[PDB]
Design a protein around this ligand. Sequence first.
Ligand code: SF4
Lengths: 270, 588, 159, 92
Amino acid sequence: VGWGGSLQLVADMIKMFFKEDWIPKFSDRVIFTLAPMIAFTSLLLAFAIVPVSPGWVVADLNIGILFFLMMAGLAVYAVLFAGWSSNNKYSLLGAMRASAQTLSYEVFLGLSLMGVVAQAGSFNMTDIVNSQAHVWNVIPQFFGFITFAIAGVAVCHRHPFDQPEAEQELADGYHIEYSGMKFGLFFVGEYIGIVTISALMVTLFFGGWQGPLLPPFIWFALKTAFFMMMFILIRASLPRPRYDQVMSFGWKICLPLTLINLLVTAAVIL
Amino acid sequence: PAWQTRDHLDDPVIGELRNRFGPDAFTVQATRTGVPVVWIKREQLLEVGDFLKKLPKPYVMLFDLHGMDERLRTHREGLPAADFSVFYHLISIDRNRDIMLKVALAENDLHVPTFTKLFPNANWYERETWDLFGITFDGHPNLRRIMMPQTWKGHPLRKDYPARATEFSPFELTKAKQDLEMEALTFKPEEWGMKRGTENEDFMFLNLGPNHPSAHGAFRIVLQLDGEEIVDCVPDIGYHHRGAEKMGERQSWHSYIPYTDRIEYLGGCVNEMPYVLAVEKLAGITVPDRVNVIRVMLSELFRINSHLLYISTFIQDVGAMTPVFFAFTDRQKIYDLVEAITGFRMHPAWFRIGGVAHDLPRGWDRLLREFLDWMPKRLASYEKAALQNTILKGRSQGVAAYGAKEALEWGTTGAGLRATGIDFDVRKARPYSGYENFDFEIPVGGGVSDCYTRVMLKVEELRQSLRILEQCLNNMPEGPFKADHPLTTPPPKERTLQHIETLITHFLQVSWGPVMPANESFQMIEATKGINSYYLTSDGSTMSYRTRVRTPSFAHLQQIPAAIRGSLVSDLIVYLGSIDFVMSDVDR
Amino acid sequence: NDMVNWGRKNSIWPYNFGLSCCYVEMVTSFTAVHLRASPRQADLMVVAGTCFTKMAPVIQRLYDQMLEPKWVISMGACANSGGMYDIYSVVQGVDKFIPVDVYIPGCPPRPEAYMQALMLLQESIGKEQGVYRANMQSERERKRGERIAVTNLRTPDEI
Amino acid sequence: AFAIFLIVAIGLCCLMLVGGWFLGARLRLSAKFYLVAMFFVIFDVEALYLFAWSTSIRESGWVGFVEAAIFIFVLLAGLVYLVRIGALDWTP
Ligand code: SF4
């Protein structure tokens, strides 16, 4: 039998290939094709800002954070052009409510990231990864860390659990009218999304490239693997939250939390 | 004996009806149903029913309404000359009595005034009578076919209609193309009931057919929407028709027993109990005590399993499903005991006419004792987990509530009717299968029937069932597992293997079938859902002449439109989950 | 290379069409093996339950919806044939109008039978409905010498 | 560089899509109430000032924290206003 956990995703990707494609009648064609890559290429190029090595850095640009926020904002268009391209009021309203909770829960990540980039004081990721040399930026900002976790798992990562189903009747999940390779494009997109959120968490909150007694790139890789396993553990443990409870614990609870977080870091930094 | 054929002419209701109407019109039949069967020409039906409805102790609930063919009965001593008949079984709860009324009809004038005005739950029953037979009920609001499709020609419960599919043409797809054209042209003519509202922007027609889980089968409930309100809900049932009633006519008394197991998938031996009791009532067999205690054990085990499934599904659909999935593991242990006794996890087919298939294996007591000592702590953990919870409790109060009158008119029995103040179980009012030698209580909801009261009552019934099961473990008597009577089918097998007369009895009983003399029996029990009954008529042959299975789920699914009118779709789905309806039971 | 064949053997997506009865054992199996299965995304349809004449067009539309590689498992005696219900209102098997690949007798089958259905269907999917000249071997014929060599069984008076 | 990686990504997208092709009116009460998203459209513009703020705070000092507290206090007053009027509540 297959001994590797990743081999299942490999077989899934192989399976999605070479599947006959049917044309949908009474549907738009340009957005039916373009909506997958707005979800895929966005988090693919979100991988372009990781400091995997000082000598093998994929991009030595001065700003990577703003690019990440630009991808976070862009991601909604995939669910929206998918909703309009569904051309079925059921699926359209399902993608409208999914994009609703998406835009609702995408607010927090920028303001939560302001704390760490303020105690870091720079946008070049070499400065952040060199800042966590002796003390990591996780001890004071517990609330910011959990807020960034919730925001990262809330962007169409299935934690809301309203993507393939709908609590409200008269409407249906928007993953029904896609049955070709686009469904595999969605899965691979959320896969690169979760691994990139984990990588950004380790290299921006914790200390990347430390190397206490072993080479630091495998130290980063193993820490990323442990946080991957913990993310999967809590994703599985996390039960489906109905739409209402998600709306209740959205703008009410974490906007004040991040605002007092900025107040605390600004008061203690000087 | 409790099986001898009585007329019940001395009964007070017969003398009150004799005083009011004097002589004539009434022919008091002699039967083994336990109730008084009276024939009343169709021109007096409504007067008699109205008088009975207002009598100083009234017959508040119409238990059953259906028809009989009656054309091929050679033994017809005392009955009026009939080519068709329609029977109406009524029940007085304050009298704990029943009455059966039979209207005779001729083949040219199959017409009787509709009875729905007095009891609304008869409406679908009369529609069913139009579908399966050809009696037209004048005054019916929407007299369309409720079981077969709308183009199905023929009335399948007539004896001139060939029963088996082999006599018709196979699925050659001649009709698949026409059904495809019909489904593609999905339009509403407004003939699906009154449909007073017009098809425009004001009213939206939505099939709303739940194919998601916990739906208890795929069905459609056409819904008229206005302001996201339930303007009118019309169920489209009959998808799961298995022809059990027609199947009962072409099977022997012994070989029908497997078909009983599939009226309710969760019932098992509960579904077998009324059939074997009715057949033994036709045979005039009094069973030993051990048969009674064994039957009580199997029926309380299956009732416990069904109640645990209802509790689990209720906590899962409107609440947190993480802890209660352990009840699935507990249900698995109940299965190892059933297949330890009967042989197979579901559909045991273990009850026989006069007894059971085998004796209990010698290690039954230790397993039952281990289940009885282990279970109470888990049951009290669920009791705290369900009585004390607040979120669904707060949500599940006053949600589509009804009272005693509302339950009575809609024929609703079971936890629904026990949730009101009427203390009425059939296991206490009409003891059967030796329940009268046990000490147990009937929980009651007070005066308000809702979903919380129903689940609390189901938990209390599970506790009473566990007390019955320990009393069965501690007071299981000794002796045979089969009655000693020539109509006990089959004979004890070790006697069959050695003795010639027992071998001959077994030969003719399993090959041609047992010959039951021509009479009519009727038994009702408390089932896993509501009250389930069997009305059997034999014409003296080795097969049933008429088998009627009254299932409460038909009434429970008929009841939804009266209460949900004025609610949201979410309340509809919650009610559908709450109500104890299974498609197999509704469509038999 | 046959990499595509490895792809199709390794992973399959099941569409659960269990009906009123016979689905509690299928759920028993599914909660051990596994909200992922979705309409218009699956290539495997496990038809279970009694295929009624009234709702058969629904099964034909769901059969049409799936992709080019179509597999069908009939489970239960009620779905392989008419089963015990040889009656006017039941069509005598789902194989009358859709092709079927694997047949799983029983009433209801066991969860282990569902497991063995996945094993025989990955075995069939791994030889390229194609016989490949290998499917003439039958479970009636393959384990025949296994079943005939059984002599003694436990007496039924014990637990 | 970044341009080479972008060319690689768009080439992979072209390769997968080309390979896939070769291989072969009235809503009434429904929807509406997107005003949470309008609240986001305005709040992202509010938080863009904090996005520009987060780069330089050590040289800002005490008046900076003071007027940032005033800013987020005004935002909090607006939020509790929207809550108490019933704008921010359960939504379809
Ligand atoms: S095979 Fe048995 S359990 Fe399954 S649907 Fe048929 S009768 Fe019911």
